[PDB]
């Protein structure tokens, strides 16, 4: 995020990080329950990647993060790679996230929800802070 | 790139107004936000765009794509979750 700010640690307990076997953090995701993560289809997750939960500082050796394996990848299948439209994938974890103060779920909306233009929302992540 | 988790507040835009920036690239299953002096960026993809509803944070967008340079004057494009929630429940249900 460009021009964002550091978050209070553990305040966004559903945010996870997607990391490849070399340990590189490539995408974010959100826990929707103990067993599933929602992320983007275009992240191209494979079951050789790992879901990191409870983490705040990626520098850290002393944080009590959870490193979760992925059992199955579910790419939406109206996902349109030409347009990046319907860009959502479900990740079914091999082992359940252990819910705690720093690890919990975000709620999902009703298909019927209204989120008006003008509404102030929040986006979080470990992406670039400057281009 | 940053080590510590970042966050930012930004407003929701209408698809129609979103289309002024992005034209025909803006599809139904997309929602724009930002253009407010902040921007989601490379590396943020897949992460949440949450809104408070009746006191609980709700998953409204999934970081998708936007400007190549993360311009803070252009809206970011997120996957619209309301449009995709039926799919999520069916998958959960069947799996």
């Amino acid at each position: 995020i460009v021009n964002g700010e550091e978050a209070v640690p553990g305040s966004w307990p559903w945010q996870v990080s997607l990391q490849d076997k070399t340990g590189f953090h490539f995408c974010g995701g959100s826990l929707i329950n103990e067993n599933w993560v929602v992320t983007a289809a275009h992240c191209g997750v494979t079951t050789s990647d790992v879901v990191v939960a409870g983490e705040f500082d990626q520098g850290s050796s002393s944080e009590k993060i959870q490193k979760l394996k992925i059992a199955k990848v579910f790419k939406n299948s109206k996902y349109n790679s030409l347009t990046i439209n319907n860009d959502i994938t479900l990740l079914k974890l091999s082992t359940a996230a252990s819910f705690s103060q720093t690890v919990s779920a975000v709620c999902l909306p009703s298909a019927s929800d209204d989120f008006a233009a003008g509404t102030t929302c929040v986006t979080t992540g470990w992406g670039l802070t400057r281009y | 790139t940053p080590d510590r988790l970042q966050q930012a507040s930004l407003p929701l835009l209408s698809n129609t107004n979103c289309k002024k920036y992005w034209g025909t690239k803006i599809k139904d299953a997309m929602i724009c936000a930002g253009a407010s002096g902040v921007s989601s960026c490379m590396g943020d993809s897949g992460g949440p765009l949450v809104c408070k509803k009746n006191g609980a944070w709700t998953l409204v967008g999934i970081v998708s794509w936007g400007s190549s340079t993360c311009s803070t004057s252009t809206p970011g494009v997120y996957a619209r979750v309301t449009a995709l929630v039926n799919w999520v429940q069916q998958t959960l249900a069947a799996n």
Binding site: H42, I84, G127 | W22, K25, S40, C41, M42, G43, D44, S45, V63, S64, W65, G66, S67, S68, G76, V77
Partner: peptide
């Protein structure tokens, strides 16, 4: 544009 670009993917994020």
């Amino acid at each position: 544009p670009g993917a994020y």
